[PDB]
């Protein structure tokens, strides 16, 4: 019994042997397995729980994007029978060529720029592709707000308040203001019109925009991997998710936001309503919600206090950034 100190299980050899890759060496590396041939050529093998039908549309989506010029993805390798996956032991395995690069550093404008460019290219290249294949962003955030309010009410009535409880209570008025401003933006007719128009025109988002899926290459581009969460969705979702992650880790340095907006805009103009949808998402106090949710619904962990402390440290810089962006959007 090793419990949570159990290593990633090796992919069964029978799966490897369905391919024609003459693999000599295999080892886990993060959430993929690296397969290497006698020349040292590498492949990334993924153990997934996605359905085979889902794997098929995912591949078809990327091949469609490619016929439109898209290059920013790891290329799938097929089995000896031409299948895009192997199904074995209740898992779906798929393999891609290896992409040389490093996980994007979302604190560097250059890396944010290239991630944004790539995400925008993916969205553009997939316009109109299987648009009805499977969205209530207002309801999601409304529920989070209701949760957040309940959580600080719970904290306030504790006999003994710990450092986290007290810190969360100290920011209630700012958190309330931000949540209210966000939900008001989601209720604005222009934001809704944007979201609905995107739903109609299609275009997929990647929807797992984390450094380990955004590989910054020696050719100074970003190549995406892991399209398992990708689906038709408004472009603002990928844009806002990239921005939030970048900005929270670069203390709201607007060079990171500019790098992002410029490179989305280069592929397709950002209209005012798209900016406003992005603002609605960014204005919501997502991190305090998420951290408090974990604490009070799941269990306390000291990392939650670290995270809330960092949010508090950055809170004025975040306010300043969102203020300047709001002004920018009024004089586009
Ligand atoms: N080259 C990536 C790993 C990878 C390539 N393809 C899939 N995963 C890295 O930074 O480690």
Helix (H) or strand (E) holding 299: none
Does residue 229 sit in the same domain as residue 146?
yes
Does residue 88 sit in the same domain as residue 133?
no
Does residue 56 sit in the same domain as residue 150?
no
CA of 56 to the centre of ligand 1 (A): 22
Question: Does ligand 1 have an atom closer than 6 angstroms to the CB of 223?
Answer: no
Ligand 1 atom at minimum distance from 30 CA: 11
Last residue of a domain, one of 78, 99, 120: 99
Does residue 48 sit in the same domain as residue 145?
no
Torsion of CA 298, 301, 305, 308, to 10 degrees: -40
8 Å CB contact between 284 and 144: yes
Name residues whose C-beta falls within 8 Å of residue 108's C-beta, 6 or more positions apart in sequence: none
Rounded Cα distance between 137 and 132, Å, is 17
Does residue 77 sit in the same domain as residue 129?
no
Question: Does ligand 1 have an atom closer than 6 angstroms to the CB of 24?
Answer: no
Rounded Cα distance between 171 and 310, Å, is 13
8 Å CB contact between 158 and 200: no
Question: Does ligand 1 have an atom closer than 6 angstroms to the CB of 101?
Answer: yes
Would you call 299 exposed, middle or buried from its count of C-beta atoms within 10 A (0-12, 13-18, 19+)?
Answer: exposed
Does residue 68 sit in the same domain as residue 125?
no
Does residue 92 sit in the same domain as residue 180?
no
Helices 163-170 and 172-186, packing angle to 10 deg: 60
From residue 312, alpha-carbon distances to 54, 248, 281, 308 in Å are 41, 11, 19, 6
Q: Are strands 42-48 and 91-97 parallel, antiparallel or unpaired?
A: antiparallel
Query: Counting every residue, how long is the chain?
Result: 332
Report how this structure was experimentally obtained: X-ray
Does residue 212 sit in the same domain as residue 229?
yes
Q: Which domain holds residue 181?
A: 100-332
Give the CB-side neighbour count of residue 214, counting CA atoms within 13 A.
25
Does residue 220 sit in the same domain as residue 120?
yes
> Beta partners for 46?
94
> Beta partners for 35?
26, 43
Our count of domains for the chain comes to 2
Write out the two tokens for 237: 């979702």
Phi and psi (nearest 5°) for 26? Answer: -140, 140
Question: Does ligand 1 have an atom closer than 6 angstroms to the CB of 211?
Answer: no
Does residue 76 sit in the same domain as residue 130?
no
Rounded Cα distance between 244 and 303, Å, is 19
Nearest to 19 by CA among 100, 93, 91, 98: 93
User: In angstroms, what is the resolution?
Assistant: 1.4
Last residue of a domain, one of 62, 81, 99: 99
Helix (H) or strand (E) holding 263: helix 254-267
CATH of the domain at 241: 3.90.1200.10
CATH of the domain at 88: 3.30.200.20
What phi-psi label fits residue 220: left (phi over 0), alpha (psi between -120 and 50 degrees) or beta? left
DSSP letter (8 states) at residue 202: B
Does residue 228 sit in the same domain as residue 311?
yes
Rounded Cα distance between 178 and 159, Å, is 28
Last residue of a domain, one of 49, 79, 99: 99
């Amino acid at each position: 019994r090793l419990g949570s100190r159990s290593q990633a299980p090796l992919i069964p050899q029978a799966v490897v042997s369905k391919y024609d890759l003459a693999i000599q060496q295999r080892h886990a590396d993060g959430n993929i397995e690296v397969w290497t041939d006698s020349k040292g050529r590498r492949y990334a093998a993924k153990r997934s729980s996605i359905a085979p039908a889902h794997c098929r549309i995912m591949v078809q989506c990327l091949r469609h994007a490619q016929e439109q010029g898209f290059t920013k993805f790891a290329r799938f390798v097929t089995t000896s029978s031409n299948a895009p996956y192997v199904r074995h032991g209740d898992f779906t395995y798929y393999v891609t060529e290896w992409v040389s690069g490093q996980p994007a550093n979302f604190g560097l404008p250059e890396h944010v720029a290239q991630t944004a460019y790539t995400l925008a290219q993916f969205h553009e290249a997939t316009r109109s592709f299987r648009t009805d294949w499977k969205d209530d962003v207002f309801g999601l955030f409304q529920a989070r707000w209701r949760d957040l309010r309940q959580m600080w009410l719970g904290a306030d009535r504790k006999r003994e308040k710990d450092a986290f409880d007290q810190l969360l209570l100290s920011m209630r008025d700012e958190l309330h203001r931000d949540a209210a401003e966000s939900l008001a933006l989601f209720e604005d007719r222009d934001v809704i019109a944007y979201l609905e128009a995107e739903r109609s025109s299609g275009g997929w988002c990647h929807l797992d925009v984390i450094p380990s899926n955004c590989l910054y290459t020696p050719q100074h581009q970003v190549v995406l991997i892991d399209f398992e969460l990708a689906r038709p969705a408004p472009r603002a979702l990928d844009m806002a998710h990239l921005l939030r992650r970048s900005l929270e880790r670069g203390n709201w340095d607007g060079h990171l936001a500019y790098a992002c907006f410029l490179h989305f805009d280069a592929v397709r103009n950002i209209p005012k309503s798209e900016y406003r949808a992005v603002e609605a998402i960014l204005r919501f106090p997502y991190l305090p919600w998420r951290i408090a949710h974990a604490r009070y619904h799941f269990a306390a962990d000291p990392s939650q206090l670290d995270a809330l402390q960092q949010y508090a440290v950055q809170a004025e810089k975040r306010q300043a950034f969102l203020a300047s962006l709001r002004q920018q959007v009024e004089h586009l």
